[PDB]
Amino acid sequence: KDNLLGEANSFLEVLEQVSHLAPLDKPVLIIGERGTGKELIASRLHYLSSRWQGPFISLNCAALNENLLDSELFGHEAGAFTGAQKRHPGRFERADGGTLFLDELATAPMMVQEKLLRVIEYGELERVGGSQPLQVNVRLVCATNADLPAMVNEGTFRADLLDRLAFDVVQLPPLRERESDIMLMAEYFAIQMCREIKLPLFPGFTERARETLLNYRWPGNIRELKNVVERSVYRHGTSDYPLDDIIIDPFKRRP
Amino acid sequence: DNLLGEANSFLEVLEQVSHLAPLDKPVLIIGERGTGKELIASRLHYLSSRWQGPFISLNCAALNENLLDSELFGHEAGAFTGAQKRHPGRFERADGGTLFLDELATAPMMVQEKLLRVIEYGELERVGGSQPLQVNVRLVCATNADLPAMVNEGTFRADLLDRLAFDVVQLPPLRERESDIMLMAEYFAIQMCREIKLPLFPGFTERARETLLNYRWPGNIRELKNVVERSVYRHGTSDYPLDDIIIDPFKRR
Amino acid sequence: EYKDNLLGEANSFLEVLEQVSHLAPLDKPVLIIGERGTGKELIASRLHYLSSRWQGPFISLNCAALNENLLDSELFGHEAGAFTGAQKRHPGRFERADGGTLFLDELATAPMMVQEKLLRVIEYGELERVGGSQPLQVNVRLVCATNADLPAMVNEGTFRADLLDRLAFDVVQLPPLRERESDIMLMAEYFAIQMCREIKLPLFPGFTERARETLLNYRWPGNIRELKNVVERSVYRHGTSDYPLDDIIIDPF
Amino acid sequence: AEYKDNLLGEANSFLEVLEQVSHLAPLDKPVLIIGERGTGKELIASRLHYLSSRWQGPFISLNCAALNENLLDSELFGHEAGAFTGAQKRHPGRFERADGGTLFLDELATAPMMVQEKLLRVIEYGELERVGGSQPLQVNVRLVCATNADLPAMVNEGTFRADLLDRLAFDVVQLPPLRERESDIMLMAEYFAIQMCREIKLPLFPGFTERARETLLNYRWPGNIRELKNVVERSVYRHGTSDYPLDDIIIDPFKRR
Amino acid sequence: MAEYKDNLLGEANSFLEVLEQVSHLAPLDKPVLIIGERGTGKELIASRLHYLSSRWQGPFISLNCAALNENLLDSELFGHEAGAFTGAQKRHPGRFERADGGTLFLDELATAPMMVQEKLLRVIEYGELERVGGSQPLQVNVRLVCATNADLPAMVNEGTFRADLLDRLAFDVVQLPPLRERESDIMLMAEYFAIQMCREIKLPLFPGFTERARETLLNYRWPGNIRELKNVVERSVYRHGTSDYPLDDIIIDPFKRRP
Amino acid sequence: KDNLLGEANSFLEVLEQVSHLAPLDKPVLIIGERGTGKELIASRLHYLSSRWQGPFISLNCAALNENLLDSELFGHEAGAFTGAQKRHPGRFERADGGTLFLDELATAPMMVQEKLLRVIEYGELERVGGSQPLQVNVRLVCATNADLPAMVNEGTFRADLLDRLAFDVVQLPPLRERESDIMLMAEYFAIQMCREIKLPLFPGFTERARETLLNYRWPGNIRELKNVVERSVYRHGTSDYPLDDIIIDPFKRRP
Amino acid sequence: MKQGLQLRLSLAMTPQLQQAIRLLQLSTLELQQELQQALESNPLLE
Ligand SMILES: Nc1ncnc2c1ncn2[C@@H]1O[C@H](COP(=O)(O)OP(=O)(O)O)[C@@H](O)[C@H]1O
Ligand SMILES: Nc1ncnc2c1ncn2[C@@H]1O[C@H](COP(=O)(O)OP(=O)(O)O)[C@@H](O)[C@H]1O
Ligand SMILES: Nc1ncnc2c1ncn2[C@@H]1O[C@H](COP(=O)(O)OP(=O)(O)O)[C@@H](O)[C@H]1O
Ligand SMILES: Nc1ncnc2c1ncn2[C@@H]1O[C@H](COP(=O)(O)OP(=O)(O)O)[C@@H](O)[C@H]1O
Ligand SMILES: Nc1ncnc2c1ncn2[C@@H]1O[C@H](COP(=O)(O)OP(=O)(O)O)[C@@H](O)[C@H]1O
Ligand SMILES: [Mg+2]
Ligand SMILES: [Mg+2]
Ligand SMILES: [Mg+2]
Ligand SMILES: [Mg+2]
């Protein structure tokens, strides 16, 4: 499919579950830490999914405000629209039969929440008069980094609607918990950045870098992975000289 | 199966609802979190003489355009630019038949007073066409009980709702329903297997059935459907009986 | 003739109605200390029908909780200025009724700012438009009704006591359900007749003294409307002119 | 031009105040009213507006307190184009009201210290506090004030800054307290009683019962703008004694019988 | 050029030296910053600077933060160019655009939005700003004027004042001698104000003031240093009349209820 | 290129770090104290980047309008509409490669935070009524007088808000920290300030005052040093005046 | 709430209505009479 970061037993099982869900057009949930890219994984699995070649929706959550699905997802394609009349494309109508991914869906308001709840209850929220229904055939996807478990417990979203929006919630475990893909990512990023930073060679994570990583809590995980990647890009040293002090923390004050 | 089997008490309530369906009286309805009080309404509407008439059910208080309550009856376009006003409206769409409300829960106190007054007196007038209100054919309200109003008083303007005592319908819990719950689950499973094009029903351990029965069913049959979906996807095979049923997709391993 | 709606056998109700007739012949301000259900909007109709100018349009129906922006717009508007919700000149204005009179309800909800604007209009009708010079006045009497103990509200300084004084050329206490008890059975009979005719029931097949005692024991926190629509639900429970309603449930709650 | 209003004000101090107003008539500086709510503060204000106006002189008796909205008072500061939902349309507004006149404020405390200081920057200078070409309109405008709040109390609130209270103040008029005047109270009371007996077209004036007159004098009536007239209409409700003279004073309108 | 000060409020104690320094700063093009009691010579100082505008044609433009519209005055802050906010039409000059090269007669209005403070700091960084919706800004010039009444350092310490505010502000401090402090021309400026009051009131001649009057004047701090004294004097022009007025001090505190 | 030189070992280190980062178009921020010439530093860097001859125009977060927020980074179509106007490029298009620094970044709202999180993508710009996104990736940089670690401690700065920055934070020495070129920096500041003052050349400059000034917090390090210098220059206003007992302590009352 | 000139906002007679209203702008007695003669159609119009 695509070049992938992480082939661990957990990562491999994730790939297997992705294959299982790929036929499953029923909406599901892939949970994980941000700065990893589970959305890209969803895109690859969608290429493997029912829509082997189909549409795709990015749909960052807080990209629409005071803009209903009717404003953007449904659109104003027909005549007699607001202002002077013309054609206007709509997302949720545009990408039927493809992929419908919701980015940072945990970042959500109550009103859009009530909208999407009915959209799920009816297949799509539809437009205008209450006599008009709709359904969307795109592969519905969504993800964020928040444990909604308490958000619904706090009522930030409708708990029943939360239950409705998916059919199988899956959570990506911490890469820091893995801490084995540490070396694999280090090497892959070393090659990629040697191609990028145009270095003579990859310095290689010397003993101190490995020890620090072993001690590192790595809160950002894949986010912290790219963070350490940039950090070592700062701490290049020499292409020959293996990087023992590879990490570079911006917050710290040297000397 | 695709219809509302319903428990015995639920069956009696269903008979009462199918009877009240011919009664086109304005109503306010209450169903559980995942009970699905809408399908019974559709069955009643078919049983109602309003079966032939339009039955536009409220679109979850959707907020398209700025017409809002004038969305109930508005204009399409000025003749000079676009099309004729063409008398299209929301309160008009449910014409000759039922009229169902949805997401009545979300409203604040002011719009609550507005709805109470509309119940007291309703008129429909639009820049585009429109037609007189005070008919509200086979009117019925629903989804208000999701967010109670004036439960300890206050909240929304439900003092008039206390005054406005048109009949209402409760919603027993799925755990309290005691219907053919396993049968409904099996029906859903068969429907999914057809949808999934599955080889067959792999089966279910009666021990697994009893263990899954250890659940409040907070989403009622909706919770049942979600748990069944998760359990089957975990099974992912038609080979052996489902000794596992999904408690919650939120977990760790 | 105003239909003598809810003709109150209560003597205090009769005195209140006599005062209502006297003041309605007058064209002077007045207050009504009454509750929703306790004469909900009925006295407004009494004033409109017995208005000092019967031809003078008394729209009444001011039990209107409108948002601060919404209420202020309901008072005043601007042509081709601001006012995103409406368009161009705002005919929507308290001057909508000239020749008749002007009333208020849910008046406890009036902000001190809105209350001040109202008192200013009461003393002198001017500046009733968001746009332009509004010295013009539409002649109309003043009346209102809210259920709050507005003496405490002013003791709380909740709104302008200026209107509270100026408008209150007569504050009329109005009867809740607990006030009228002798007329309770008669009003129940009147409502039952109205329902049977409306429900096409020939009549109530029979009334049990137990039924009357139970209904009287069942209080009416909403003085009329709660009792009225409770009777609606109870008749729906009975539904048969042949079947007497001895214990027809008033309300689901 | 316009005569000051007729008002039964037999209080000799009230007469002195009227004389003070007479002195202020040609004068062009701010005036305050420290009159009570229900002390005819607006009434004396109108008398003043007529007298000092003295040549078809415009007045303005408006309360931004009635202007319930912030954007409302913002519009009261004129805008030429893009004014709220409006776009490129004229709106003279309150500026025209004060054009060739003065400003009379009834209980101006409700104004925010932001609004207060807006008015402060307007007062001494006068150039147009409005979105307009160079906003240079320092119109020939005076001002006058009326509120029941206390100056130290306002300082505690701080809603009136130092220069606010000061460049606000050039004259002050505390209306005679409703508790202060006793004889003039019954005097204006009889005046209004006659006014009612006339306007109501009642063929007979009931007059005034001695017990009723004594009760009215004992009645605090700290509000007496028309709360006196209100109690007058209260007894007029107990009409039918037009030939008679029987006491009927409505103390608690909420209370019945 | 050299113009007669339209006012003659001078307090010889230090406002003489203050005026000397102000004249020194008058040719300068750096930020003009002032501080002191409102109703006390400070807006008068603003007049002083505005006349003290080197050469002429400098637009003595004054905009007061309290005299504005929250969430809306921004359209007039850096300018307006496009439709849907300035009523379409043309590039609508904002308060800043209304004064290019002219005086930024700001006073420390201490408006609630520190956002306003930053927006001004955005204007006051390098002489550059943009009308609303303009894809191209405009780097401009204008005289800059500030006047205050409160301890900006305290509020910044209290976090109430944007440190950046006083930072982009305050080319230097300009405080004022209080009426409890200046006390130089009490009788002299009193005579000047009384002369104006007589020229208005058309009384026959100067009524005169007793020594007890000046005694109470010394006893008074005069909270509105330049103004509250003028209030006393103006009220003195009222009440009793003619030349007989002399003793019995004067009418200083209108707020003071009559004895 | 014609800005104040720090003339410090830390200042030299910062200059070298900027020189190293000159080709790097990766996202960045100015940590430390804005209003101490972080603006000038970023500007001179924009002059000397890999795209030295490129269109660079910085921007401040707190500038635009909440309603016009969508019109901030971009432009709306509004063809036959109320705000009818031509296809407008807008900011994220208006820069297109150069340095548009994220100033006032500490002064942002959570809604603007969502906007930036959308901007975390290299272009892919969806406008109002737009058909297809456009990828406008540019040399990216910001400024932060605040401690984003403490900000995420308060949480108002999202973890993604921190993630947007793609550079390890270079920090400059505060007033107490730097205190290196204080005499020389004061000398240059006096040169400029007296060139403004047009007074005769200062015959008096006593370094004992400079020493006592070193015994001061100088919270406005870059600004207030020269500020008090020029303020004392104006207050003294004398050429033959030694740097003795002269100080701009506006908080202090004169005696 | 408050109002603003910028918002999602929801006309002017064109061609046919222009000549129509011009018939009103033209005098009905004679100026419109020439056009009415020029009609020469809509036989269902006596
Ligand atoms: N398996 C992987 N292979 C390559 N890159 C990856 C992998 N997982 C994550 N990434 C990197 O992590 C980033 C995650 O981006 P994205 O999915 O947009 O985050 P979010 O979903 O929080 O917006 C991607 O830019 C990608 O380069
Ligand atoms: N007795 C029943 N007969 C048929 N379908 C049912 C029954 N109970 C539950 N359902 C299903 O449960 C789902 C609940 O969906 P929804 O209407 O959103 O629930 P609610 O009305 O509680 O919000 C419905 O789609 C419906 O198909
Ligand atoms: N001389 C008078 N005789 C009778 N009534 C008077 C007289 N002067 C004033 N009033 C009454 O006092 C009422 C309140 O006046 P006023 O106190 O000026 O109002 P405001 O509260 O605006 O100051 C008016 O309605 C008026 O009828
Ligand atoms: N030294 C003075 N001599 C005479 N009059 C003065 C003097 N100082 C102030 N005034 C009076 O104060 C008024 C100016 O008020 P001012 O202090 O400028 O208001 P603000 O404080 O709002 O700028 C003038 O009318 C003037 O008569
Ligand atoms: N290293 C330095 N040497 C001499 N003068 C300096 C130095 N740094 C700053 N300055 C002076 O102080 C001022 C600092 O402002 P600036 O650095 O532009 O603020 P910012 O960069 O934070 O916007 C400049 O105008 C400059 O004249
Ligand atoms: Mg993403
Ligand atoms: Mg539902
Ligand atoms: Mg008044
Ligand atoms: Mg001033």
| Tokens, residue A253 | 């004050």
Q: Which residues in E lie closer than 8 A to residue F63 (C-beta atoms)?
A: 78, 119, 122
Shortest CA distance to D1 belongs to which of D48, D40, D41, D54? D54
* Nearest-neighbour CA in chain D from C219: distance (Å): 24
Ligand with minimal distance to A15 CA: 1
Distance F245 CA to ligand 5 centre (A): 25
**Do residues E85 and F68 touch, judged by C-beta distance below 8 A?**
yes
Q: Do chains F and C touch (3 or more CB pairs under 8 A)?
A: no
Shortest CA distance to F18 belongs to which of F137, F161, F172? F172
CA B112 to CA B94: how far, in whole Å? 22
Q: Is the CB of F104 under 6 A from ligand 5?
A: no
Strands in E101-105's sheet, in edge-to-edge order, are E60-61, E101-105, E142-145
Angle at D120 between CA D114 and CA D123, to 5 degrees: 145
Nearest CA owner, ligand 2 atom 21: B36
Give the dihedral sign, CA D158/D161/D162/D166. Answer: negative
Sequence-separated (6 or more) residues with CB below 8 Å from residue C70: B110, C85
| Tokens, residue D111 | 């104004």
DSSP A102-134: EETTTS--HHHHHHHHHHHHHSB---SSTT--B
Instruction: Decide which of 2.60.40.420, 3.40.50.10330, 3.40.50.720, 3.40.50.300 is the CATH code for B2-174.
Output: 3.40.50.300
Interchain CB contacts (distance < 8 Å): A and G: 8
CA E33 to CA F220: how far, in whole Å? 18
* Residue owning tokens 């040093």: F225
CA F46 to CA A81: how far, in whole Å? 45
Q: Do G10 and A82 touch (CB under 8 A)?
A: yes
**Beta pairing partners, A31:** A171
Q: Which residues in G lie closer than 8 A to residue D70 (C-beta atoms)?
A: 2
* Nearest-neighbour CA in chain E from D217: distance (Å): 25
Q: Do G10 and B66 touch (CB under 8 A)?
A: yes
What residue spans define the domains of chain F?
Answer: 3-175, 176-255
In this structure, CATH architecture of domain C178-253: Orthogonal Bundle (1.10)
Angle at B130 between CA A116 and CA C229, to 5 degrees: 75
φ/ψ of residue A227, rounded to 5? -60, -50
Q: Is the CB of D191 under 6 A from ligand 3?
A: yes
Burial pattern F29-39, b for ≥16 Cβ within 10 A else e, equals: bbbbbbbbbbb
**Do residues A218 and A175 touch, judged by C-beta distance below 8 A?**
yes
CATH topology of domain A3-175: Rossmann fold (3.40.50)
CA C158 to CA C178: how far, in whole Å? 28
**Do residues D197 and D243 touch, judged by C-beta distance below 8 A?**
no
* Nearest-neighbour CA in chain C from D196: distance (Å): 13
Shortest CA distance to D230 belongs to which of D38, D25, D27? D38
Angle at C209 between CA C203 and CA C215, to 5 degrees: 80
* Nearest-neighbour CA in chain A from B131: distance (Å): 16
Phi-psi region of F80 (alpha: psi -120 to 50; beta: other; left: phi over 0): beta
Please state which CATH number belongs to domain C5-177.
3.40.50.300
Shortest CA distance to F193 belongs to which of F238, F242, F231, F236? F231
CA D4 to CA D22: how far, in whole Å? 9
**Do residues D242 and D54 touch, judged by C-beta distance below 8 A?**
no
Q: In angstroms, what CA-CA distances link A27 with A148, A157, A166, A198, G17?
A: 17, 18, 5, 43, 54
Q: Do G12 and B65 touch (CB under 8 A)?
A: no
Given resolution (angstroms)? 6.6
* Helix, strand or coil, per DSSP, at residue D146: strand
Q: Which atom of ligand 1 is closest in space to residue A40's alpha carbon? A: 17
**Do residues E143 and E32 touch, judged by C-beta distance below 8 A?**
yes
CA A216 to CA E57: how far, in whole Å? 67
CA F157 to CA C181: how far, in whole Å? 65
Residue G38 burial by CB count (10 A; 0-12/13-18/19+): exposed, middle or buried?
A: exposed
**Do residues D131 and E77 touch, judged by C-beta distance below 8 A?**
no
Shortest CA distance to F72 belongs to which of E87, E133, G7? E133
Nearest CA owner, ligand 5 atom 9: F4
CA E44 to CA A254: how far, in whole Å? 53
Distance C99 CA to ligand 8 centre (A): 27
Sequence-separated (6 or more) residues with CB below 8 Å from residue F62: E115, E118, E119, E122, F104, F107, F108
Sequence-separated (6 or more) residues with CB below 8 Å from residue A170: A14, A17, A28, A29, A30, A31, B249
Give the dihedral sign, CA C97/C103/C109/C114. Answer: positive
CA A1 to CA D78: how far, in whole Å? 64
**Do residues D202 and D239 touch, judged by C-beta distance below 8 A?**
yes
**Do residues F216 and F39 touch, judged by C-beta distance below 8 A?**
no
> Taking an 8 Å Cβ-Cβ cutoff, which residues of chain F contact chain E?
34-35, 39, 60, 62-63, 65-68, 71, 75, 82-85, 88-91, 94, 104, 107, 196, 219-220, 223-224, 227, 230-231, 234-235, 237, 248, 250-251, 253-254
Sequence-separated (6 or more) residues with CB below 8 Å from residue C8: C14, C17, C175, C180, C183
Sequence-separated (6 or more) residues with CB below 8 Å from residue C229: B163, B164, B165, B166, C251
| Tokens, residue C188 | 């129940």
Shortest CA distance to F29 belongs to which of F118, F105, F88, F126? F105
By Cβ distance, the residue of B20, B109, B165 closest to C230 is B165
Please state which CATH number belongs to domain D6-178.
3.40.50.300
- CATH homologous superfamily of E7-179: P-loop containing nucleotide triphosphate hydrolases (3.40.50.300)
Ligand with minimal distance to B7 CA: 2
Give the dihedral sign, CA F23/F24/F25/F27. Answer: negative
CA F182 to CA F225: how far, in whole Å? 8
Shortest CA distance to F142 belongs to which of F124, F119, F173, F123? F119
In this structure, CATH architecture of domain E180-259: Orthogonal Bundle (1.10)
Q: Indicate the class that CATH gives domain D179-257.
A: mainly alpha
| Tokens, residue A165 | 């929006």
CA E194 to CA E188: how far, in whole Å? 10
Nearest CA owner, ligand 2 atom 15: B36
Mutate to test the interface with G, among D69, D85, D91, D131 (most CBs of G within 10 A): D85
CA D208 to CA D244: how far, in whole Å? 9
Q: Cα C158 vs. chain centroid, distance in angstroms?
A: 22
For this PDB entry, the determination method is cryo-EM
Distance D47 CA to ligand 3 centre (A): 10
| Tokens, residue E218 | 């010394």
Q: Is the CB of A108 under 6 A from ligand 1?
A: no
Ligand with minimal distance to A35 CA: 1
By Cβ distance, the residue of A66, A71, A83 closest to G10 is A83
Distance F175 CA to ligand 4 centre (A): 43
Task: Give the residue from chain D lying closest to E254, CA to CA.
Answer: D172
Q: Indicate the class that CATH gives domain B175-253.
A: mainly alpha
Q: How many residues does chain C have?
A: 253
| Tokens, residue D125 | 């200078």
CA A118 to CA A125: how far, in whole Å? 6
Q: How many residues does chain B have?
A: 253
CATH topology of domain F176-255: Helicase, Ruva Protein; domain 3 (1.10.8)
